[PDB]
Structure formats: C-alpha cells, structure tokens
C-alpha cells in the first residue's frame, strides 16, 4: 500500500 497516502504527485 501507499502506507496511508491518499494521493501521490
């Protein structure tokens, strides 16, 4: 998972 990040960039 993104480890709790909703969006990346």
């Amino acid at each position, epitope marked *: 998972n*993104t480890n*709790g990040s*909703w*969006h*990346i960039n």
Partner: antibody
Amino acid sequence: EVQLVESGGGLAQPGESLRLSCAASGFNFYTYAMTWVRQAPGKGLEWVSASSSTDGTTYYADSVKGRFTISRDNSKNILYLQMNSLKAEDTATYYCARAVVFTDSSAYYYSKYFDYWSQGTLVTVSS
Amino acid sequence: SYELTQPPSVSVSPGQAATITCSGDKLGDKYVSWYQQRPGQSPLLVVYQDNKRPSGIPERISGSNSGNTATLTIRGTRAMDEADYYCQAWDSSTDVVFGGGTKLTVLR
C-alpha cells in the same frame, strides 16, 4: 477489532456550522488514510473528504470544497469534519471510513476502497 | 464528470445467481470495489480490487471486471441478500466515484 465511533452532527440552521468527529481504535491509525462519505436520504453514496495518514494532505469533493475541512490527530486517533456554511444539499447520513490506497509505480492507476465504516450520523440542515 | 452506471433495480429468484453490472468508459484499468448496504445499516465491503473477497464475507459473493463492465454476482440468492449494492472506483476528474446503486429484489 476495528472500531470507528462518530459524534457531533444532528440539526443545524442553513449558513451555520456543525463539526463531526470520528474516534478510532483496534488498528494502526498512523498507516491509514481516513475518510468521510455521505448519503442523502433515499439517495446514493458520495465521497466527501480524505486525510492522508502522516503528511497532513487533505482532499475534497467539488461539492464541499471551501466549506468543509477534514483534519486529524494521530496522537489521539481522531478524525474531524468541520462543516461550515451548511446547505439543504448537505442533509445526509455521514459515515467515517477507513480507506485502503494501493501501490502504483506512477499515478493514473488507483485502487481506493473503504474496508471499515462507522454506524453513520444524520446531519439535517433546516430552519 | 466521470460517471459509474448501475441498473436502478435487479430481481432474482431464491437459489438463482443475481448479476449487478457497473459501467464506465475505460473501466479495464480501474479497480472496482463493491459495497452491500442492507436497510438502516452502514455499507459493508463485499469485494475489493475487482475480485478479492474480505474475511467474513461468504464464498457465494464474488466480484469480476472484464472490459468496460464490472460485475457483482451472488451465488444462490437468499432472502437476507435483499440490499442496495454500490460499485466504486477512482478517476482523475472525480477522485473516489460511486455508482448510483442497485436495489436487489427477491422474487417470491
């Protein structure tokens, strides 16, 4: 055992404010994005807002941007939803939900799902 | 502006398989999750990432996504399966997007 207890909400006049809270336990709150999803009476599910786990970033549906503010306290395992300038269209059952966001090399590809939901709280906006 | 399309109602005889469709442009690369919402209750995750099943969900409920239509199928429908079912995905234009929902009616 994953638990999400919602408080606040209820009745409010249009133009006024209400603040929702979501208390969490039984999981690692530090590793999860936390969300608000609402449902207008007899209508469908609508995503409202999201808070990322540690970087302080916040996300909103176009319908609520500027009026609603999501915030969290990892040290207290609590999610808040400050709802300002309430409208009749905001009348709905509000759920707080734990979200799962997945591992993508670049963006454009996303798997976001709500695996645990609170019981839900009714927000009525009326004179 | 991106939309997910569900039939407003689906009817099925007990012991038969109900098929709930979810439609959207370029749905192939999107990950579809499904929610069961029984009357007066919170939505419950029944399918995640097109076809994965959570622990607690019966083997009868399984998901699928082929082409531009996502599919929820319930093997041997029972009376307790009457609920509203929602498909959900993600798009750059909407972030989290939900289908309008589908009410499952049991034919007796």
